[PDB]
Amino acid sequence: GSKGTVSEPTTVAFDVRPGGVVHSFSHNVGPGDKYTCMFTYASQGGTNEQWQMSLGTSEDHQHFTCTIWRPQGKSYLYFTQFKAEVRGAEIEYAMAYSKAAFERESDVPLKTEEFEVTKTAVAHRPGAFKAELSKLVIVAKASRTEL
Numbered sequence: 001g002s003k004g005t006v007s008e009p010t011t012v013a014f015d016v017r018p019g020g021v022v023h024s025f026s027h028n029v030g031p032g033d034k035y036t037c038m039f040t041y042a043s044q045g046g047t048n049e050q051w052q053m054s055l056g057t058s059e060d061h062q063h064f065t066c067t068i069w070r071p072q073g074k075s076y077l078y079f080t081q082f083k084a085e086v087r088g089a090e091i092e093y094a095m096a097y098s099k100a101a102f103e104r105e106s107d108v109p110l111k112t113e114e115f116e117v118t119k120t121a122v123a124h125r126p127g128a129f130k131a132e133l134s135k136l137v138i139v140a141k142a143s144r145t146e147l
Helices: none
Strands: 010-016 022-029 035-044 049-057 062-070 079-085 091-099 115-117 121-125 135-140
Touching: 010 022, 010 121, 022 049, 035 049, 035 062, 062 121, 079 091, 079 135, 091 121
Parallel strands: none
Antiparallel strands: 010 049, 022 035, 035 079, 049 062, 062 135, 079 121, 091 135, 115 121
16 A cells, blocks of 8 residues: 555576477466566577576556576577567567676676567577577566557
């Protein structure tokens, strides 16, 4: 009441399974599944990795974010393709990091040219991506076509 509707980000962990097989993941936050964040990717390797993903929404339910990160800050997996698609809102800002900062070492962000950002989904750029993925941040504003 006095607080004015207060909520906290939701974090869900999942397994990354290599082998050149395309996999899809998704999560719904809030009643009515108003906010949906989907993450589909294909990697090559023989080692499983646990990735953390967190979703957040604004007080007025006007803005939400979808963040995926590596607990160790780096991914040994070899990425051949990836895509992030969201529903219930439009993508305003997207960013990815090749390698996370370790103490003295600074962060290594990915060049815009290396990936493509569209109003409905974000897909990698072929011949530009270095096959490195560590952290993804997506910021979107709630909006509906209304038919």
